[PDB]
Design a protein around this ligand. Structure first.
Ligand SMILES: *Cc1c(COP(=O)(O)O)cnc(C)c1O
Ligand SMILES: *Cc1c(COP(=O)(O)O)cnc(C)c1O
Ligand SMILES: O=C(O)CCc1ccccc1
Ligand SMILES: O=C(O)CCc1ccccc1
Lengths: 396, 396
C-alpha cells in the first residue's frame, strides 16, 4: 500500500532545525526559526510562567477533559487582549473563542470551518508570505493566491501595488492579514493605511482573517492591536487566529486561539457550533497546560505585571541587537547599506541575501538563515555578532 | 458570510458533560463520558504524574518547539509498550511514530495521510461504533461502512456475522479494530479469533488500523497487546493510533501517538515523510507537557513501578464496581438478568437500556448515561450504587 508513496519535501523552517542539530561544527549560529534567545545564548522559560507552573502543580486536582473550546477564562482574556477593555464586540457578545493547539492549529480550524460551511474558494496571502499559510489552506481544499506587498528595491510597503493586486479579489473571497510584525518582512501598515484597507474591504466584500502571532513585539500590547481593532469597528464578521507561543515563550505547549465574529449573538452562536464540529473531527479538545498558564497569569495582577515587564525586556533586547547588527556590518566592511533593517519590526530581518548566499553562509560558515534571506535578530548576541557579521560580509 | 449557517448537533459524548454541568439537581450522577473516578468520586491526578510534573518544574530550562514528530523518547517507549521489548519491528527499524494531540489527533493524522497518499477510499468500522470514528474519517473525505459485531440477544461477539459482513471489504480497504476494551461493547475477540482475523486480512488484502486507547484496563499491559501483536507478525503494513489519556489519567494534556509500519526501513521512511507533511498542515508540532510526563515515567524504573501499580488499582476497582452493580440491580428489583455485564472489559457496560430509558433516567432521576445505553462503571461508587440502581429499576 505504501510501496508507491513519494518522499515529501521538508518544512523549510522547522526542517532547518534538524539540519542545525546535525552539524558537528563548533561555532554554528542559528538565525533560523523564530525563537527568542537571551544574552547568554539561551531560550529560557519566562519567570512568570515558572511561577504559574508552580501554582498549577500545587493546586490542580484533576486532568478532566476540557470542553471542545477549552478554558472559558482563557477565552475572556484573549478577547480583551484582542479587542480592548470594554469593546462592544465583547459587550454585544458578538465574539466566540476556541482555545487551539497553537495559532497553527487555529489556522487549520478556520480553514476547515470555512471550507465546509461557507462558499469560500480562495484565500489571498501576501507576497512574500509565511510558508505554512499555503499548506494549511490547500489542505482544506482552498485556493491560495497572492497579493503584492513588499517593495524590494525600496524596502517598503508598496501600498497601491498592494491595493491594485487586491482589486482582483472577489466579494466573498478571504483576505489574510498579519496583525503586526509582518513575517517575514517586518514591514507593517500605518494606522492610516489600516483604516484604508478596512474601509475598502467592507466595500469590496472580503472576509478578513488575521494571523496575530506577535502581539507586543512591535510597540506594545494595546498598540499592536490597532489595525485589527480598526477592522473590527467596520466589520460584521471576521476571524482571528492568535498565538501565545512568542509573547509567553510557550512554543512547545501550543497555546493559541481562534476567534470568530459575526453581526450578532444569535449568529455567532450558530456559526461557532460548526467550528466546534470541525474541532471534534480533528483533535477533539485542546491541551490544558500551556493555556492554564496563560489564563493564570492574565488573571493575577502580580503575575501579569511581571509578565509584561519580561515582554518589554524581550522587545528592547531585540531593538538593541538590530542597531548593533547594522553597526557592525558597517564596521566590518559590507558592500551594501543595511540601514533599512532598522525600520523593520518584530524578531526578524528580511536581509536581502540571495538563495545561494544563504546556502553558502551555511555550508561554509555554519550560520543558519531561511532561504528567503530571513534572519532571526532575536537569536543575535554580543558574543556571536562579530563572527556572524563576518560571515555575511564574506558572502556579499 | 455566516448568515445561513445551520447549527450543528453537539457531540453525543462531550455534549453530555455540558448538560451535566448545567443540571442543578443535588444528587446528579454522571455515568456518561469515560473518565476514571475513585472511591470518593473524584477524577484524580495520578501520583506518578504529580511526581513527574515536579521533576519537570525543576529541570526544564526551555519551551523550544519540539519536532513535527515529537519527543524521540516518547516514540521509542511507545513502540515497546506496543510491540514488546525486543520485537523485530523495532529491530528492523520498520516502524515510525509521531506524538500527536491525543488518540483523537492520531485518528485525524492517519485519515489525512491515507486520503492524500494512497488509493484508500473506504474505512470499515464496527457496529456499534464509537461515535467519533465517523466524523474523523468523513472529514478526510473517506467513506465509512459498518461491519457486524455484537450480538444483542446473547450479549456476545458474533464471529460469523463479523466474518460474513467483511466479505464485502475490497482489497485495499481499511479495516479498523479496537486493540482491547471495545468501546462501547466491552467485548473483545479471543486470541484465537484475533489470530484468525489476522489471517484473513492478509489473504483479503486489507490495511488494518488499530484504535488502542485502553492498554492495561482489560487484563494487563502485555496481555492487552496480544491481538495487535498477532497482527504485527503477519502484516507488512499497519497503522496504530494509541492514547495515554486513560492509562495515565492525562485526559486534558492530549497525549497519544500514531505509529506507521511498512515492509522496510526505506519504505516506512519515505511514507512517514508524508505523515509529517500532513501534520505540518494541521497543528505543526505536538504539545510537550503530557508527553514529557509519559516519557519521564516510562524511562524511570521507580516512577514506572508506582505507575503500573496505580493502573492495576484502577482496573481492580472497576472489576469490583462491576460485580457490585449486578448484585445490587438483582437484589434491588431488576426484571432482566444483567449478569452478561460481568463479561465485559474496560470502563463501561453496554447495559441493554433503551434510548427512552436513558432519556428518562436523566430527566427524572438525574442519572447520565450515553444514548446507546452505555454506562461508565468507573464512575460508580459504593455510595452512589444504591440510588443509581434504583433509578434503573424504576425505568425497566
Ligand atoms: C508563530 C506564528 C504563527 C503561530 O505559530 P504557533 O507556534 O503555531 O502558534 C502563525 N503565523 C505566523 C506568521 C507566525 O510567525
Ligand atoms: C479515549 C478513546 C480514544 C482517544 O481519546 P483521546 O483522549 O483523544 O486520546 C480513541 N478511541 C476510543 C475508542 C477511545 O475510547
Ligand atoms: O520561524 C517562524 O516563522 C515562527 C515559528 C514557526 C515556524 C514554522 C511553523 C510554525 C511556527
Ligand atoms: O467516553 C469515551 O468514549 C472516551 C472519551 C472521549 C469522548 C468523546 C470524544 C473523545 C474521547
Amino acid at each position: 500500500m505504501f510501496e508507491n508513496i513519494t518522499a515529501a519535501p521538508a518544512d523549510p523552517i522547522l526542517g532547518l532545525a534538524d539540519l542545525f542539530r546535525a552539524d558537528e561544527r563548533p561555532g554554528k549560529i542559528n538565525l533560523g526559526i523564530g525563537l527568542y534567545y537571551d544574552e547568554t545564548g539561551k531560550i529560557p522559560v519566562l519567570t512568570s510562567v515558572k511561577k504559574a507552573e508552580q501554582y498549577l502543580l500545587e493546586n490542580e486536582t484533576t486532568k478532566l477533559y476540557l470542553g471542545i473550546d477549552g478554558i472559558p477564562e482563557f477565552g475572556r482574556c484573549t478577547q480583551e487582549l484582542l479587542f480592548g477593555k470594554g469593546s462592544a464586540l465583547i459587550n454585544d457578545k458578538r465574539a466566540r473563542t476556541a482555545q487551539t493547539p497553537g495559532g497553527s492549529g487555529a489556522l487549520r480550524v478556520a480553514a476547515d470551518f470555512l471550507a465546509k460551511n461557507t462558499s469560500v474558494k480562495r484565500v489571498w496571502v501576501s507576497n512574500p508570505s509565511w510558508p505554512n499559510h499555503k499548506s494549511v489552506f490547500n489542505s482544506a481544499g482552498l485556493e491560495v493566491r497572492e497579493y503584492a506587498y513588499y517593495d524590494a528595491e525600496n524596502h517598503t510597503l508598496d501600498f497601491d501595488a498592494l491595493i491594485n493586486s487586491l482589486n482582483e479579489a472577489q466579494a466573498g473571497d478571504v483576505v489574510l492579514f498579519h496583525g503586526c510584525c509582518h513575517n517575514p518582512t517586518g514591514i507593517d501598515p500605518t494606522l492610516e493605511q489600516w483604516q484604508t484597507l478596512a474601509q475598502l474591504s467592507v466595500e469590496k466584500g472580503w472576509l478578513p482573517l488575521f494571523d496575530f502571532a506577535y502581539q507586543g513585539f512591535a510597540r506594545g500590547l494595546e498598540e499592536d492591536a490597532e489595525g485589527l481593532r480598526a477592522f473590527a469597528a467596520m466589520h460584521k464578521e471576521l476571524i482571528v487566529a492568535s498565538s501565545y507561543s512568542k509573547n509567553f515563550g510557550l512554543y512547545n505547549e501550543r497555546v493559541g486561539a481562534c476567534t470568530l465574529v459575526a453581526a450578532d449573538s444569535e449568529t455567532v452562536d450558530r456559526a461557532f457550533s460548526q467550528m466546534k464540529a470541525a474541532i471534534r473531527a480533528n483533535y477533539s479538545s485542546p491541551p490544558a497546560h500551556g493555556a492554564s498558564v496563560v489564563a493564570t497569569i492574565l488573571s493575577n495582577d502580580a503575575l501579569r505585571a511581571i509578565w509584561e515587564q519580561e515582554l518589554t525586556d524581550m522587545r528592547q533586547r531585540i531593538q538593541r541587537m538590530r542597531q548593533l547588527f547594522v553597526n557592525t556590518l558597517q564596521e566590518k566592511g559590507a558592500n551594501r547599506d543595511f540601514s533599512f533593517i532598522i525600520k523593520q519590526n518584530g524578531m526578524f530581518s528580511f536581509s536581502g541575501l540571495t538563495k545561494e548566499q544563504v546556502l553558502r553562509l551555511r555550508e561554509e560558515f555554519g550560520v543558519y538563515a531561511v532561504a528567503s534571506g530571513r534572519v532571526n535578530v532575536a537569536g543575535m548576541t554580543p558574543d556571536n555578532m562579530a563572527p556572524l557579521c563576518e560571515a555575511i560580509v564574506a558572502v556579499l
